[PDB]
Coordinates of C-alpha atoms and ligand atoms in Angstrom, one line a residue:
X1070 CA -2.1 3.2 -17.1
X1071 CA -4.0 0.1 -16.7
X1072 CA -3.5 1.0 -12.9
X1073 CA -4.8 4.5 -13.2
X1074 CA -7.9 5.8 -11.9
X1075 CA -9.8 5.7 -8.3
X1076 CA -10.0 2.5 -6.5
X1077 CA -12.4 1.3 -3.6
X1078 CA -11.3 -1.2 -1.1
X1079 CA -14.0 -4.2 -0.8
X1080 CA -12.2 -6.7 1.0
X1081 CA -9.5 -7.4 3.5
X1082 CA -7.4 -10.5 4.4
X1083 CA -4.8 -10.7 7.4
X1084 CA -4.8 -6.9 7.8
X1085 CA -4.1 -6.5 11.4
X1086 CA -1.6 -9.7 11.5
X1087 CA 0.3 -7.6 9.2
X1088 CA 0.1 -4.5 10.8
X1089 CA 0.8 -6.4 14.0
X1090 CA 4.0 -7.9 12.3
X1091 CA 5.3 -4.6 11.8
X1092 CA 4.7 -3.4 14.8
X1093 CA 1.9 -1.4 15.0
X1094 CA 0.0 -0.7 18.0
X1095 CA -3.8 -1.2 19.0
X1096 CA -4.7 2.2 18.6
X1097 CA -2.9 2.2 14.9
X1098 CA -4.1 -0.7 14.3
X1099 CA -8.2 -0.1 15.3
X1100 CA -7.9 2.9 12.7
X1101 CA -7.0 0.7 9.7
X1102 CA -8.6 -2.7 10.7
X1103 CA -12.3 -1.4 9.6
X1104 CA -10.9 1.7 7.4
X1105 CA -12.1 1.4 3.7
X1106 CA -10.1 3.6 1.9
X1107 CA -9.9 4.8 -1.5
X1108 CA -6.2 4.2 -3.3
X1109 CA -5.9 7.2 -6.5
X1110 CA -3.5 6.7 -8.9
X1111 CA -2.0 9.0 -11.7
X1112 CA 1.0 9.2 -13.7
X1113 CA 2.3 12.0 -15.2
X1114 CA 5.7 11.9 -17.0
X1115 CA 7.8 9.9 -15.3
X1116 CA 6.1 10.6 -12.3
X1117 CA 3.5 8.2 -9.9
X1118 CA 1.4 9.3 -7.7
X1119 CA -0.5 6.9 -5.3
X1120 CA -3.4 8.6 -2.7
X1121 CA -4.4 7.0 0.2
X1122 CA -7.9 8.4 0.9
X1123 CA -9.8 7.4 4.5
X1124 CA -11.8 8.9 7.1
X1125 CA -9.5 8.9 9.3
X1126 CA -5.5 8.6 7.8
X1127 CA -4.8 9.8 4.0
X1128 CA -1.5 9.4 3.1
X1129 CA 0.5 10.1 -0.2
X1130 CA 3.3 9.2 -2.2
X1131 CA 5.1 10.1 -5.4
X1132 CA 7.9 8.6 -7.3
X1133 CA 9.7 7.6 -10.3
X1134 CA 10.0 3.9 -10.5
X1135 CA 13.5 2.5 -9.9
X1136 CA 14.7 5.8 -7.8
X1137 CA 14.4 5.4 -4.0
X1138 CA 12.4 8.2 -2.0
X1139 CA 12.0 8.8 1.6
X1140 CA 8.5 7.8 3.0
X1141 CA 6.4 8.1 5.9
X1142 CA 3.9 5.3 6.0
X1143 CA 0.4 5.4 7.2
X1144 CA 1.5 3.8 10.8
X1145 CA 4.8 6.2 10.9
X1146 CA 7.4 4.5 9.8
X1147 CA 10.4 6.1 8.3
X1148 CA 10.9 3.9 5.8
X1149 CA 13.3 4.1 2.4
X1150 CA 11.0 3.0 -0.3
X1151 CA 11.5 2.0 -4.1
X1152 CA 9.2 0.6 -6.4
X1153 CA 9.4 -1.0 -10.0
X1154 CA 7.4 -2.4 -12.6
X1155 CA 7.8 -6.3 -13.1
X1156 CA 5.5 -8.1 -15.6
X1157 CA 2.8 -6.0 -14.9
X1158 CA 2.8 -5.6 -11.1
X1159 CA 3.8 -2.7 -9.3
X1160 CA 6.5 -3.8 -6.7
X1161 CA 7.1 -1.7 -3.6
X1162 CA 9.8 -2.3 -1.3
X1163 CA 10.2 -0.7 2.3
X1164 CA 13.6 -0.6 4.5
X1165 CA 13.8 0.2 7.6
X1166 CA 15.7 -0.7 10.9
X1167 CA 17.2 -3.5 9.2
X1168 CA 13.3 -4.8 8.3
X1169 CA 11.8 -4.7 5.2
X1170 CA 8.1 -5.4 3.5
X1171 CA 7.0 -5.6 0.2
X1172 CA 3.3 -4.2 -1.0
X1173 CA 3.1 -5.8 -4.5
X1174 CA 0.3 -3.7 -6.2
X1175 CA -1.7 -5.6 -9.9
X1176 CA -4.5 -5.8 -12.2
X1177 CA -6.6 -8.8 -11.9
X1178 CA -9.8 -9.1 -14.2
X1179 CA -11.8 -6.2 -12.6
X1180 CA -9.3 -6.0 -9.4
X1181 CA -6.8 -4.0 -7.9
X1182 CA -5.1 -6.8 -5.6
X1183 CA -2.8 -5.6 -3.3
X1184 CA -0.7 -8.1 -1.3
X1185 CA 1.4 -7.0 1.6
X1186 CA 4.2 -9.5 3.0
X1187 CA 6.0 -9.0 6.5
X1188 CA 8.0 -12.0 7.8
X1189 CA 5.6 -14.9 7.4
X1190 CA 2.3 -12.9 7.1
X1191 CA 0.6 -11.8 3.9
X1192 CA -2.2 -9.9 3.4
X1193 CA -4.6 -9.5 0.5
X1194 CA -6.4 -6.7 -0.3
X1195 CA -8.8 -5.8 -3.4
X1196 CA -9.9 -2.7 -4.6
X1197 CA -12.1 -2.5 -7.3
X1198 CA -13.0 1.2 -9.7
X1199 CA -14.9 3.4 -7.9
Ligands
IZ7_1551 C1 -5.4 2.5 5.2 O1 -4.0 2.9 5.3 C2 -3.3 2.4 6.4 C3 -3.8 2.7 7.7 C4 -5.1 3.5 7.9 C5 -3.1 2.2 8.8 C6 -3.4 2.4 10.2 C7 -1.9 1.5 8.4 O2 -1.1 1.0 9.4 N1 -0.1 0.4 8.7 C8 -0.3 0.5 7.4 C9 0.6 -0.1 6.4 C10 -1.5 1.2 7.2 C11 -2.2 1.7 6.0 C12 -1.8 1.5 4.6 C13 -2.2 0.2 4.0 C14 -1.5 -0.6 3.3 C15 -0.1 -0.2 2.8 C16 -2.0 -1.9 2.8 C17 -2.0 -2.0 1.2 C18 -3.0 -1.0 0.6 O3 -4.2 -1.3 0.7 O4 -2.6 0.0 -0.1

């Protein structure tokens, strides 16, 4: 939709405090703190599909929006994730272990802005067409 096509990250705010804040360790952390990936999005039917493209982690998921799916996140989390539309932004919830973070996914003039919470961090990331 307005979110579908290929996207390329070009900039990165409080990345590693967020990974940090969910535990991640260095190693985890070195391979996304520099990583520019590429996020590919597609609908088909009810069905979303959101591809995680980098040189060294590509990760995948695929849903229907409202209907909770199992996923295993880039850092390996096993996490129960649902995600819904709200005024135009994608909102994606993860629970696990009694935790949860939210990756809140919208259009923004030429932007994909992608804002990641944990406890008190947040993270910003943009993504603009490839
Ligand atoms: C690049 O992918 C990675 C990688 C490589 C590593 C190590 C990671 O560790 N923890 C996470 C989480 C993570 C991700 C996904 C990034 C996000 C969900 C941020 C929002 C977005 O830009 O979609």
């Amino acid at each position: 939709d307005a979110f579908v096509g290929t996207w390329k990250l070009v900039s990165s705010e409080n990345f590693d405090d967020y990974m940090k804040e969910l535990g991640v360790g260095f190693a985890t952390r070195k391979m996304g703190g520099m990583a520019k990936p590429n996020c590919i999005i597609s609908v088909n039917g009810d069905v979303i599909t959101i591809k995680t493209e980098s040189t060294l982690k590509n990760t995948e998921i695929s849903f229907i929006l409202g209907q909770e799916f199992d996923e295993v996140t880039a850092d390996d989390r096993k996490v129960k994730s649902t995600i819904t539309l709200d005024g135009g932004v994608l909102v994606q919830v993860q629970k696990w272990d009694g935790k949860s973070t939210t990756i809140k996914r919208k259009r923004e003039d030429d932007k994909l802005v992608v804002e990641c919470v944990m406890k008190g961090v947040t993270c910003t990331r943009v993504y603009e067409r490839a």
